[PDB]
Homo-oligomer: A and B are copies of this chain.
Amino acid sequence: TSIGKIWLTVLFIFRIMILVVAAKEVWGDEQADFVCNTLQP
Contacts and interface: CB of A to CB of B under 8 A. Distances in A.
Interface of A: 37-40
A37 B36 CA distance: 12
Contacts of A37: 38-40
A34 to B, nearest CB: 14
A33 B15 CA distance: 56
A9 B40 CA distance: 51
Most buried by B among A37, A39, A40: A39
A17 to B, nearest CB: 40
Nearest to A37: B39
Nearest to A39: B37
Nearest to A35: B39
